[PDB]
Structure 1
Amino acid sequence: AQFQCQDDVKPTSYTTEEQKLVDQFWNESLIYLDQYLKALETPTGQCKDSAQATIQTYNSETGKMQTQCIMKYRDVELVAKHLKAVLAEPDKAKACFDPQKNYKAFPLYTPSAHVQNLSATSKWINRPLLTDYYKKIGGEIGAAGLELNENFLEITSRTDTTLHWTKDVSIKGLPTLWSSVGWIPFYAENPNAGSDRFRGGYLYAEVMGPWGNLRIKEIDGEKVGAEIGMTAQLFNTSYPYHYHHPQEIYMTLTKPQCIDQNKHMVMHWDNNQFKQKRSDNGWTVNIDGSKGKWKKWFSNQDPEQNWLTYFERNAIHAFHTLEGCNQTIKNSGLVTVWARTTAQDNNQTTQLCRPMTGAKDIKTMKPEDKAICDLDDWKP
Structure 2
Amino acid sequence: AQFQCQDDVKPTSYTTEEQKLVDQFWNESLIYLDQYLKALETPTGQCKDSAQATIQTYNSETGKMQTQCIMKYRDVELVAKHLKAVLAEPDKAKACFDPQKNYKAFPLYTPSAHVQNLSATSKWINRPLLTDYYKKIGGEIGAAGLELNENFLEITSRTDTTLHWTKDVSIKGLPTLWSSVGWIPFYAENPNAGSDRFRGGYLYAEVMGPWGNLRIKEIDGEKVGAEIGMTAQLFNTSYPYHYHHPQEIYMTLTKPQCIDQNKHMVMHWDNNQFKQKRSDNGWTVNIDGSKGKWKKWFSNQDPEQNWLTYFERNAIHAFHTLEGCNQTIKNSGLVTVWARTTAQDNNQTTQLCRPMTGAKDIKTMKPEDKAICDLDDWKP
Measured against the shorter chain, the TM-score band is over 0.9
Q: Give, in whole Å, the separation in 2 of the partners of 1:325 and 1:188.
A: 25
Alignment RMSD, CA only?
0.1
SS of residue paired to 1:317: strand
**Cα distance in structure 1, aligned partners of 2:356 and 2:11:** 49
1:350 CA displacement: 0.1
Give 1:332 deviation, angstroms: 0.1
List per-residue Cα deviations over 1:138-172 (Å, max 9, x = no partner).
Answer: 00000000000000000000000000000000000
Shift of 1:111: 0.2
**C-alpha separation between the residues in 1 aligned to 2:63 and 2:106?**
43
C-alpha separation between the residues in 1 aligned to 2:365 and 2:209?
30
Deviation string 1:59-91 (CA, Å, 9 cap, x unpaired) is 000000000000000000000000000000000
CA separation in 2, counterparts of 1:130 and 1:299?
31
- Structure 2, gaps ≥5 residues long: none
Describe how 1:31-110 pairs up with structure 2 within 5 A: 31-110=31-110
**Distance in 2 (alpha carbons) for counterparts of 1:18 and 1:377:** 46
Q: 1:214 deviation in Å?
A: 0.2
**Whole-Å separation in 1 of the counterparts to 2:169 and 2:296:** 31
Deviations 1:171-211 (A, max 9, x none): 00000000000000000000000000000000000000000
Aligned mates of 2:151, 2:141 — CA distance in 1? 16
1:288-327 aligned at under 5 Å gives the runs: 288-327=288-327
Name the CA distance, whole Å, in 2 between partners of 1:12 and 1:244: 35
Distance 1:223 1:153 in 2: 35
Instruction: Report how far residue 361 of structure 1 moved.
Output: 0.1
1:363 aligned partner? 363
CA distance in 2, matches of 1:296, 1:330: 27
State the distance in 1 between where 2:141 and 2:108 align: 18
Normalising by structure 1, what TM-score? 1.00
What TM-score comes out, normalization by structure 2 length?
1.00
Write the distance in 2 (CA, Å) between the matches of 1:305 and 1:185: 30
Q: Secondary structure at the match of 2:95?
A: helix
Shift of 1:256: 0.1
2:132 matched residue in structure 1:
132
Offset from partner CA, 1:243-288 (integer Å, 9 cap, x none): 0000000000000000000000000000000000000000000000
3-state secondary structure, aligned to 1:96: coil
Offset, 1:240: 0.1
Deviation at 1:107, TM superposition (A): 0.1
CA distance in 2, matches of 1:227, 1:103: 18
**1:29-67 deviation digits (Å, cap 9, x = unpaired):** 000000000000000000000000000000000000000
CA distance in 2, matches of 1:112, 1:322: 26
DSSP-derived class of the 2:131 partner: helix
Q: Return the alpha-carbon distance in structure 1 between the equivalents of residues 368 and 294 of structure 2.
A: 6
- Which secondary structure does the structure 2 equivalent of 1:23 belong to? helix
Q: For 2:63 and 2:79, how far apart are their aligned partners in 1?
A: 31
Measure, in 2, the Cα distance between the counterparts of 1:19 and 1:360: 52
Report the Cα offset of residue 375 of structure 1. Answer: 0.1
SS at match of 2:145: helix
Q: Aligned partners of 1:142 and 1:53: how far apart in 2?
A: 36
- Whole-angstrom distance in 1 between the partners of 2:129 and 2:64: 43
Alpha-carbon distance in structure 2 between the residues aligned to 1:287 and 1:18 = 52
Between the two proteins, the alignment pairs up a number of residues equal to: 380
Find the counterpart in structure 2 of residue 211 from structure 1: 211
Alpha-carbon separation, structure 1, partners of 2:296 and 2:256: 20
- Equivalent position SS for 2:122: helix
- CA drift at 1:98: 0.2
Give the Cα–Cα distance (whole angstroms) in 1 for the partners of residues 63 and 319 of structure 2: 20
| Alpha-carbon distance between aligned partners in 1 of 2:111 and 2:82, rounded to the nearest angstrom | 30
Which whole-Å deviations, capped at 9, do the CAs of 1:225-248 have from their partners, x for residues lacking one?
Answer: 000000000000000000000000
Q: For residue 258 of structure 1, what is the aligned residue in structure 2?
A: 258
CA distance in 1, matches of 2:93, 2:62: 45
* Whole-angstrom CA distance in 2 between matches of 1:289 and 1:15: 57
**SS at structure 2 position matched to 1:80:** helix
Which residue pairs with 2:22 in the alignment?
Answer: 22
CA distance in 1, matches of 2:372, 2:29: 39
Identity of aligned residues (%): 100
CA distance in 1, matches of 2:195, 2:130: 19
